[PDB]
Amino acid sequence: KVRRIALANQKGGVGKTTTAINLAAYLARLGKRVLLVDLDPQGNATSGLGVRAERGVYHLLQGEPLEGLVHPVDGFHLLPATPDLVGATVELAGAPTALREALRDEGYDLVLLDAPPSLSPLTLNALAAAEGVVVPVQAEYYALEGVAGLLATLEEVRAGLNPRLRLLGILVTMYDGRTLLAQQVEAQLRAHFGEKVFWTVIPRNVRLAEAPSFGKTIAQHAPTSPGAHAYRRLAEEVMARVQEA
Amino acid sequence: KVRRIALANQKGGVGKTTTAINLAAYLARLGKRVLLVDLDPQGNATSGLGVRAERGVYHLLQGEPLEGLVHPVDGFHLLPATPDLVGATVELAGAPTALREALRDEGYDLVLLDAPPSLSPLTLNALAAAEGVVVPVQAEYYALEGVAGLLATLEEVRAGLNPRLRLLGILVTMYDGRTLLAQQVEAQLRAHFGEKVFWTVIPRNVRLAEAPSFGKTIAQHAPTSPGAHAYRRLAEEVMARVQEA
Ligand SMILES: Nc1ncnc2c1ncn2[C@@H]1O[C@H](COP(=O)(O)OP(=O)(O)O)[C@@H](O)[C@H]1O
Ligand SMILES: Nc1ncnc2c1ncn2[C@@H]1O[C@H](COP(=O)(O)OP(=O)(O)O)[C@@H](O)[C@H]1O
Ligand SMILES: [Mg+2]
Ligand SMILES: [Mg+2]
C-alpha cells in the first residue's frame, strides 16, 4: 500500500521539485487528498508555489501540529520549507526515522516528499518515511550511472532503515525534442531498466520553466501546454503503479 | 508469441495507416525484420510510402511468391495493395482464413496488417490471421462506444475464427494539445479500459499529416517532430507488450 512517495536522486536540477509540484496538482484533480512536503532548505517547492512561510517542516519536527503548518495550494496542501530547516540537518543526522515519526498524515491519500539534491539527512529522512520513490532523470548519458547508484542507495535503505521502500519509477524529464540524443538515451534507459522506467516522459518546455517564477503549477499557468498534458498522464500512470503495487 | 499485429477499428480516418507505417519505421530501427501488409483497396499505406505497384496482396492470394511482391521501404518490406484488391472481397467473403494460409511470412519478426476502415472480409481476414490487435482511436467521445464494439468483435473472432487473437492495445491518436477535451477523453478511456490503453499517445501534428503526401515515414520526413518521438516510444511500448504477452 503506497501512500508516501519520495522524489529523489543524486543531482539537482533534474526535475524533482517540478514533478512534486505538478503531480500534486494533477493528483488533487484526480480527487485525491494530497500533501506536498518540502524537505529542501532552499525551499524551491514552497517558492514555486508562491508561498512565503515562517513555519514549516522544521516546526513539525519540534512537535507543532500539522494542521496549523500546512498551506492550501491549488487543491492540495503544502507543508512548506522555511529558512530555518537547515538547522535540523545535524539533529536528523543520526535520526533517519525522525520524519517517519513526525508525519501523522493519516488524513491524506497521497504524500509527496520533495527531497533536496543531496543524500543529506533530509533526503535520508524522506527515503526512510516513504513507500515509493520516483527518480527524475534527464535523458542524458550520465543518467544510467546516476540511476544505478540511486537504486543501490534504495536497496541499502530498504535493507537497513525501511523495508517498505520500493522504486515506483524512473521518470525521464526535460526531454529535449529538438534532438535525436534524447531518443537514444531514453531507449538505453528502457533497455537497461525495463518496466522501471515510466512510459510518460516530461518534455522540456518553456511553460514548465516559467511556472515557478509565477508561483503557479502548470495546471494554473499553462493547462494545455505540452508539460501539462504530460504531468496529467503521469499522475494517471503513478496511480496505476500505486494500484498495482 | 505475438508476431502478426492487426491495426483495426470500425471507422476510417482514425490513424490505422499512420500507425502501421510509423510502427514499421521504428520497429525496423529497433533491429526487427518487419513486413507491412496493405489490406486496403484504397492502398493508403502503399501510397503513403511513395510506392506504385501493379502486384500486391491480390497476387499473394492467387499463389504468387511473397519475395517477388514485396517492396523495400525505409528498412522494412511492404506487401502493397493494388487497385485490383477490391476483386478479392467477394472470394474472401466466406473465406476468412484465406490470408492466414497465404501468409508464409516465416522470415519476418513482426508483421503489420493495415486493415481497411470496415469490417469487410479483408478486415476479417486481418483479424483471423493476427495474434495481436492495435486499435487506434481519437480522444473524442464516440471512441468509448467504438472501442467497446471493436472489443466485442475481437471476442467473437476469438471464439469462432482465431483463438490466438488478443488485444495488444488501444492507442490514442491525433491527441489535440490545444484543448482540455482530449485530456478528459483520455482519462475516461483509461478509467474504463485500464491497462488496455497504451501509455504512449500520438499527438496531432502537422508533420505527421504531411508525411504520406511526401511518400515518407515520419522518421524520414521529420525525425525530431513530436510524432516521431511518440511513434519511436510506441514501438518500444509495443515490444514490451509483445515480450510480456
Ligand atoms: N520539463 C521541463 N522543461 C523545462 N524546464 C524544466 C523542466 N523541469 C524542470 N525545469 C526547470 O529546471 C530547473 C530545475 O528544476 P527542479 O524541478 O527544481 O529540479 P530539482 O528539484 O531536481 O533540482 C527549474 O527552473 C525548473 O523550472
Ligand atoms: N497524429 C496525427 N496528427 C495529424 N494528422 C494525422 C495523425 N494521424 C493521422 N493523421 C492524418 O489523418 C488522415 C487519416 O489517417 P490514417 O492513418 O490514414 O487513418 P485510417 O488509416 O485509420 O483511415 C491522414 O491524412 C493522416 O495523415
Ligand atoms: Mg528540488
Ligand atoms: Mg488506413
XYZ file of C-alpha atoms and ligand atoms in Angstrom:
546
model
C 0.000 0.000 0.000
C 1.906 3.029 -1.343
C 0.934 6.361 0.261
C 4.167 8.329 0.675
C 6.266 8.912 -2.423
C 9.723 10.431 -2.322
C 11.074 12.417 -5.267
C 14.809 11.780 -5.132
C 18.120 11.477 -6.962
C 21.821 12.336 -6.570
C 21.909 15.577 -8.587
C 19.992 18.835 -8.515
C 18.298 20.495 -11.488
C 16.804 17.203 -12.664
C 13.090 17.933 -12.059
C 12.281 16.672 -8.533
C 10.557 19.894 -7.442
C 8.775 20.330 -10.820
C 7.490 16.741 -10.603
C 6.488 17.101 -6.938
C 4.508 20.275 -7.613
C 2.795 19.115 -10.793
C 1.997 15.578 -9.645
C 0.295 17.162 -6.631
C -1.624 19.489 -8.982
C -2.976 16.591 -11.050
C -3.434 14.011 -8.277
C -5.621 16.569 -6.436
C -7.521 16.991 -9.694
C -7.953 13.186 -9.725
C -9.855 13.566 -6.450
C -7.022 12.590 -4.102
C -6.195 14.359 -0.838
C -2.542 15.291 -1.324
C 0.115 16.667 0.978
C 3.249 18.095 -0.606
C 6.177 18.211 1.873
C 9.114 20.489 1.045
C 12.288 18.965 2.545
C 14.748 21.282 0.797
C 16.237 24.130 2.888
C 16.358 26.199 -0.349
C 12.551 25.859 -0.277
C 12.143 25.688 -4.079
C 8.739 23.938 -3.911
C 7.454 26.470 -1.376
C 8.703 29.341 -3.566
C 7.480 27.705 -6.776
C 4.005 27.645 -5.253
C 4.041 31.396 -4.446
C 4.167 30.844 -0.708
C 6.195 32.614 1.956
C 6.272 30.733 5.262
C 7.656 31.401 8.724
C 6.726 27.906 9.899
C 7.136 24.553 8.135
C 8.818 21.139 8.357
C 11.307 22.447 10.975
C 8.375 23.225 13.263
C 6.714 19.861 12.519
C 9.818 18.049 13.815
C 9.743 20.101 17.053
C 6.182 18.895 17.719
C 3.918 21.671 16.392
C 0.614 20.417 14.820
C 0.374 19.513 11.114
C -2.972 21.295 10.617
C -1.615 24.738 11.573
C 1.525 24.423 9.417
C 0.044 23.488 6.010
C -0.916 25.979 3.282
C -3.816 25.396 0.858
C -2.404 25.462 -2.695
C -4.143 24.591 -5.997
C -6.458 21.997 -4.391
C -3.732 20.378 -2.282
C -1.837 21.128 0.928
C 1.785 22.234 1.162
C 3.890 21.593 4.261
C 6.421 24.349 3.467
C 10.164 24.658 3.989
C 11.378 27.620 5.954
C 14.895 29.207 6.078
C 15.327 27.505 9.477
C 15.165 23.918 8.119
C 18.965 23.822 7.643
C 19.292 23.731 11.468
C 17.656 20.287 11.661
C 20.238 18.604 9.395
C 22.610 17.959 12.313
C 19.848 16.513 14.543
C 18.366 14.457 11.658
C 21.881 13.132 11.037
C 21.804 10.164 13.394
C 17.983 10.268 13.386
C 16.936 8.982 9.930
C 13.445 7.921 11.089
C 12.540 11.321 12.620
C 10.361 12.371 9.674
C 8.694 8.937 9.678
C 7.545 9.515 13.294
C 6.694 13.230 12.904
C 4.442 12.573 9.869
C 0.978 11.995 11.358
C -0.565 12.339 7.898
C -3.406 9.819 8.400
C -5.962 12.102 6.660
C -4.163 12.397 3.307
C -4.433 9.886 0.443
C -1.001 10.585 -1.028
C 2.068 12.308 0.411
C 4.789 13.728 -1.844
C 8.232 14.230 -0.266
C 10.327 16.669 -2.285
C 13.903 15.790 -1.267
C 16.956 18.085 -1.573
C 19.615 17.457 -4.326
C 21.761 15.562 -1.827
C 21.741 12.397 0.172
C 21.590 14.660 3.231
C 19.842 13.511 6.432
C 16.723 15.226 4.969
C 16.875 13.041 1.835
C 17.528 10.018 4.041
C 14.589 11.034 6.238
C 12.497 11.164 3.042
C 13.619 7.647 1.997
C 13.035 6.219 5.481
C 9.497 7.659 5.616
C 8.336 6.749 2.072
C 6.881 3.594 0.478
C 7.570 4.675 -3.118
C 10.331 6.534 -4.920
C 10.112 8.454 -8.163
C 13.550 9.187 -9.604
C 13.574 12.037 -12.157
C 16.425 11.870 -14.694
C 17.396 13.846 -17.802
C 17.664 11.838 -20.984
C 21.441 12.460 -20.887
C 24.213 9.844 -20.728
C 25.245 10.281 -17.071
C 21.698 9.208 -16.090
C 22.484 5.482 -16.357
C 25.165 5.703 -13.647
C 23.200 8.188 -11.549
C 20.222 5.815 -11.679
C 22.233 2.666 -10.825
C 23.748 4.499 -7.845
C 20.368 5.723 -6.591
C 18.982 2.174 -6.997
C 21.849 0.823 -4.884
C 21.096 3.524 -2.295
C 17.421 2.433 -2.302
C 18.498 -1.172 -1.769
C 20.645 -0.115 1.203
C 17.888 1.974 2.803
C 15.450 -0.961 2.276
C 17.893 -3.354 3.961
C 18.689 -1.125 6.956
C 16.080 1.572 7.554
C 12.871 0.983 5.616
C 11.778 -2.455 4.304
C 8.676 -0.811 2.742
C 10.842 1.174 0.319
C 10.373 0.409 -3.367
C 11.125 2.153 -6.615
C 7.809 3.399 -8.023
C 9.559 4.522 -11.199
C 12.270 6.289 -13.110
C 10.895 9.394 -14.807
C 12.541 10.908 -17.903
C 12.216 14.698 -17.525
C 13.230 17.711 -19.677
C 13.210 15.523 -22.776
C 14.546 17.840 -25.491
C 12.547 17.186 -28.658
C 14.904 19.196 -30.907
C 17.499 16.411 -30.852
C 17.851 12.652 -31.511
C 20.084 12.152 -28.447
C 17.151 12.165 -26.042
C 15.538 9.334 -28.064
C 18.738 7.322 -27.789
C 19.198 7.848 -24.061
C 15.538 7.024 -23.389
C 15.899 3.786 -25.402
C 19.016 2.841 -23.416
C 17.325 3.640 -20.098
C 14.489 1.298 -21.116
C 16.928 -1.329 -22.445
C 18.715 -1.357 -19.105
C 15.953 -0.724 -16.506
C 12.877 -2.025 -18.377
C 9.454 -1.641 -16.734
C 11.038 0.551 -14.002
C 11.017 3.485 -16.447
C 7.649 5.307 -16.637
C 6.118 5.395 -20.114
C 5.113 9.033 -19.629
C 8.053 11.333 -20.399
C 8.125 15.032 -19.472
C 9.075 17.344 -22.388
C 11.473 20.225 -21.969
C 9.065 23.134 -22.351
C 9.342 26.872 -21.620
C 5.962 26.970 -19.845
C 7.197 24.441 -17.240
C 10.335 26.523 -16.615
C 8.139 29.642 -16.339
C 5.563 28.305 -13.856
C 7.526 28.501 -10.557
C 8.569 32.121 -11.232
C 4.803 32.853 -11.267
C 4.269 30.722 -8.133
C 1.809 28.533 -10.048
C 1.516 24.866 -11.033
C 1.485 24.121 -14.768
C -2.243 23.425 -14.409
C -2.739 27.032 -13.270
C -0.047 28.581 -15.503
C -0.466 26.778 -18.872
C -3.136 23.996 -18.748
C -2.914 22.990 -22.442
C 0.883 23.158 -22.741
C 2.922 20.003 -23.543
C 4.088 19.774 -19.893
C 0.556 19.959 -18.506
C -0.718 17.064 -20.655
C 2.371 15.018 -19.652
C 2.050 15.592 -15.875
C -1.678 14.804 -16.014
C -0.902 11.479 -17.733
C 1.963 10.880 -15.290
C -0.462 11.276 -12.380
C -2.630 8.593 -14.089
C 0.460 6.408 -14.567
C 1.572 6.908 -10.952
C -1.903 5.897 -9.781
C -1.821 2.773 -11.969
C 1.527 1.749 -10.394
C 0.301 2.564 -6.869
C -2.831 0.422 -7.516
C -0.784 -2.492 -8.912
C 1.832 -2.243 -6.143
C 4.009 -15.439 -29.068
C 2.761 -12.324 -30.898
C 4.134 -11.901 -34.441
C 1.253 -10.583 -36.552
C -0.443 -7.398 -35.399
C -3.592 -6.043 -36.984
C -4.332 -2.316 -36.990
C -8.118 -2.159 -36.876
C -11.262 -0.297 -35.852
C -14.787 0.492 -37.094
C -14.157 3.966 -38.545
C -11.734 5.427 -41.054
C -9.536 8.484 -40.516
C -8.518 7.324 -37.042
C -4.801 6.626 -37.664
C -4.522 2.929 -38.629
C -2.384 3.578 -41.719
C -0.269 6.256 -39.949
C 0.373 3.839 -37.064
C 1.100 0.912 -39.405
C 3.635 2.919 -41.404
C 5.398 4.547 -38.466
C 5.490 1.487 -36.207
C 7.166 -0.338 -39.096
C 9.644 2.555 -39.441
C 10.665 2.363 -35.778
C 10.444 -1.412 -35.269
C 12.860 -1.822 -38.220
C 15.079 0.731 -36.498
C 14.868 -1.465 -33.368
C 16.517 -4.215 -35.419
C 13.368 -6.189 -36.244
C 12.570 -7.688 -39.647
C 9.180 -6.158 -40.433
C 6.602 -6.797 -43.116
C 3.901 -4.185 -43.618
C 0.830 -5.632 -45.409
C -1.601 -3.185 -47.021
C -5.103 -4.726 -46.938
C -6.980 -1.593 -48.004
C -8.146 -1.425 -51.653
C -7.639 2.380 -51.449
C -3.963 1.492 -50.887
C -3.263 4.399 -48.498
C -0.227 2.705 -46.887
C 1.240 1.872 -50.300
C 0.683 5.472 -51.452
C 1.888 6.937 -48.153
C 5.159 5.090 -48.692
C 5.682 6.563 -52.196
C 5.142 3.252 -53.939
C 3.217 2.438 -57.097
C 2.540 -1.282 -57.510
C 0.994 -3.471 -60.187
C 1.220 -6.550 -57.968
C 0.409 -6.950 -54.265
C -1.834 -8.775 -51.782
C -4.286 -9.736 -54.580
C -1.474 -11.636 -56.288
C -0.342 -13.214 -52.992
C -3.805 -14.764 -52.551
C -3.668 -16.234 -56.090
C -0.430 -18.049 -55.196
C 2.372 -15.789 -56.471
C 5.543 -15.780 -54.255
C 5.948 -13.336 -51.344
C 9.575 -12.488 -52.205
C 8.736 -11.089 -55.662
C 5.787 -8.998 -54.422
C 7.380 -7.022 -51.553
C 8.975 -3.571 -51.894
C 11.935 -2.428 -49.759
C 10.866 0.717 -47.864
C 12.714 2.602 -45.086
C 14.415 -0.548 -43.725
C 11.283 -2.710 -43.882
C 9.270 -4.563 -46.522
C 5.878 -3.521 -47.866
C 3.436 -6.034 -49.336
C 1.481 -3.413 -51.318
C -2.189 -3.033 -52.196
C -3.055 -2.744 -55.840
C -6.254 -1.359 -57.498
C -7.257 -4.996 -58.141
C -7.582 -5.951 -54.438
C -11.288 -4.985 -54.411
C -11.955 -8.071 -56.595
C -10.942 -10.447 -53.782
C -13.563 -9.135 -51.326
C -16.253 -11.459 -52.710
C -13.975 -14.541 -52.602
C -12.615 -13.619 -49.132
C -16.236 -13.276 -48.003
C -16.861 -16.870 -46.971
C -13.090 -17.445 -46.720
C -11.978 -15.554 -43.577
C -8.827 -17.674 -43.092
C -7.501 -17.143 -46.654
C -4.931 -14.534 -45.597
C -3.870 -16.756 -42.681
C -2.957 -19.544 -45.156
C -1.466 -17.273 -47.856
C 0.899 -15.568 -45.362
C 4.075 -17.678 -45.464
C 5.947 -14.946 -43.592
C 8.272 -17.251 -41.603
C 11.315 -14.983 -42.213
C 9.887 -11.806 -40.653
C 9.980 -10.956 -36.931
C 6.853 -8.798 -36.936
C 4.003 -8.473 -39.432
C 1.763 -5.393 -39.500
C -1.670 -5.809 -41.123
C -3.144 -2.448 -42.098
C -6.891 -3.169 -42.291
C -9.479 -1.115 -44.231
C -11.957 1.201 -42.350
C -14.598 -1.529 -42.459
C -15.282 -4.936 -41.066
C -15.019 -6.154 -44.664
C -13.771 -9.682 -45.449
C -10.294 -8.055 -45.713
C -10.539 -6.731 -42.134
C -11.877 -10.111 -41.034
C -9.010 -11.805 -42.880
C -6.657 -9.499 -40.942
C -8.258 -10.453 -37.588
C -8.225 -14.173 -38.414
C -4.521 -14.061 -39.351
C -3.226 -11.905 -36.449
C -2.189 -12.643 -32.845
C -2.373 -9.012 -31.683
C -4.617 -6.043 -32.374
C -3.801 -2.375 -32.016
C -6.929 -0.221 -32.066
C -6.255 3.456 -32.883
C -8.864 5.889 -31.517
C -9.218 9.679 -31.386
C -9.542 11.161 -27.933
C -13.155 12.066 -28.819
C -16.329 10.924 -27.037
C -17.586 8.389 -29.610
C -14.367 6.396 -29.008
C -15.740 4.639 -25.910
C -18.570 3.023 -27.900
C -16.406 2.402 -30.960
C -13.867 0.668 -28.710
C -16.443 -1.463 -26.836
C -17.882 -2.582 -30.185
C -14.466 -3.470 -31.612
C -13.664 -5.378 -28.389
C -16.888 -7.369 -28.776
C -15.920 -8.062 -32.403
C -12.493 -9.288 -31.199
C -14.201 -11.574 -28.690
C -16.390 -13.019 -31.462
C -13.470 -13.594 -33.843
C -11.521 -15.234 -30.954
C -14.468 -17.538 -30.213
C -15.134 -18.566 -33.829
C -12.172 -17.963 -36.130
C -8.953 -17.267 -34.248
C -8.341 -18.331 -30.611
C -4.884 -16.661 -30.760
C -6.469 -13.218 -31.140
C -5.819 -10.751 -28.333
C -5.984 -7.015 -27.915
C -2.397 -5.729 -27.815
C -3.654 -2.235 -27.022
C -5.855 0.761 -27.571
C -3.837 3.656 -28.972
C -4.933 7.289 -28.534
C -4.011 9.069 -31.788
C -4.317 12.680 -33.057
C -4.396 13.944 -29.482
C -5.085 17.670 -29.886
C -2.958 19.526 -27.340
C -4.741 22.873 -27.858
C -7.761 21.690 -25.863
C -8.679 20.158 -22.472
C -11.220 17.774 -24.047
C -8.546 15.347 -25.205
C -7.261 15.112 -21.600
C -10.765 14.289 -20.411
C -11.451 11.651 -23.049
C -8.052 10.029 -22.458
C -8.775 9.887 -18.700
C -12.166 8.271 -19.362
C -10.658 5.758 -21.796
C -8.177 4.783 -19.064
C -10.898 4.781 -16.378
C -12.946 2.365 -18.456
C -10.352 0.161 -20.244
C -7.387 0.423 -17.835
C -4.104 -1.261 -18.808
C -5.529 -1.966 -22.308
C -4.805 1.664 -23.252
C -1.176 2.283 -24.323
C 0.644 4.886 -22.235
C 2.197 6.380 -25.370
C -0.238 8.794 -27.035
C 0.230 10.146 -30.570
C -0.063 13.967 -30.821
C -1.972 15.658 -33.600
C 0.913 17.206 -35.520
C 1.204 18.773 -38.991
C 4.386 16.828 -39.812
C 2.524 13.502 -39.394
C -0.263 14.698 -41.711
C 2.392 15.869 -44.203
C 4.483 12.675 -44.346
C 2.303 10.449 -46.596
C 1.943 13.214 -49.219
C 5.767 13.025 -49.464
C 5.664 9.200 -49.523
C 7.879 9.099 -46.425
C 7.638 7.775 -42.863
C 7.866 10.367 -40.081
C 11.380 9.060 -39.406
C 12.373 10.093 -42.942
C 10.181 13.223 -43.124
C 10.582 14.857 -39.668
C 12.728 12.739 -37.261
C 12.661 15.192 -34.315
C 8.986 16.165 -34.605
C 6.525 15.372 -31.764
C 5.025 12.488 -33.808
C 8.406 10.881 -34.460
C 9.357 10.769 -30.757
C 5.895 9.320 -29.957
C 5.979 6.538 -32.593
C 9.520 5.581 -31.553
C 8.350 5.222 -27.932
C 5.225 3.389 -29.119
C 7.421 0.856 -30.925
C 9.249 0.358 -27.574
C 5.890 0.028 -25.796
C 4.569 -2.425 -28.404
C 7.712 -4.524 -27.969
C 7.296 -4.506 -24.176
C 3.700 -5.797 -24.556
C 4.737 -8.390 -27.163
C 7.510 -9.602 -24.785
C 5.132 -9.777 -21.793
C 2.365 -11.436 -23.834
N 10.337 19.639 -18.256
C 10.978 20.811 -18.031
N 11.132 21.716 -19.024
C 11.772 22.889 -18.831
N 12.299 23.256 -17.647
C 12.217 22.442 -16.561
C 11.528 21.146 -16.693
N 11.590 20.552 -15.489
C 12.256 21.391 -14.657
N 12.626 22.522 -15.297
C 13.363 23.677 -14.714
O 14.699 23.325 -14.315
C 15.024 23.934 -13.055
C 15.334 22.856 -12.021
O 14.157 22.061 -11.876
P 13.728 21.413 -10.492
O 12.425 20.687 -10.702
O 13.747 22.442 -9.385
O 14.919 20.333 -10.281
P 15.366 19.686 -8.872
O 14.260 19.983 -7.901
O 15.567 18.219 -9.163
O 16.651 20.402 -8.532
C 13.807 24.739 -12.630
O 13.979 26.108 -13.016
C 12.674 24.165 -13.448
O 11.669 25.150 -13.693
N -1.276 12.136 -35.192
C -1.729 12.724 -36.326
N -1.642 14.063 -36.492
C -2.091 14.676 -37.607
N -2.650 14.015 -38.639
C -2.800 12.664 -38.608
C -2.329 11.923 -37.424
N -2.593 10.625 -37.651
C -3.179 10.539 -38.872
N -3.297 11.757 -39.445
C -3.878 12.061 -40.781
O -5.283 11.764 -40.845
C -5.609 11.144 -42.099
C -6.183 9.752 -41.857
O -5.173 8.988 -41.198
P -4.980 7.432 -41.444
O -3.804 6.973 -40.622
O -4.923 7.122 -42.921
O -6.349 6.851 -40.797
P -7.019 5.422 -41.134
O -5.967 4.620 -41.844
O -7.437 4.862 -39.796
O -8.189 5.767 -42.022
C -4.316 11.051 -42.892
O -4.223 12.165 -43.789
C -3.229 11.198 -41.854
O -2.055 11.784 -42.420
Mg 14.076 20.459 -5.787
Mg -5.889 3.150 -43.444
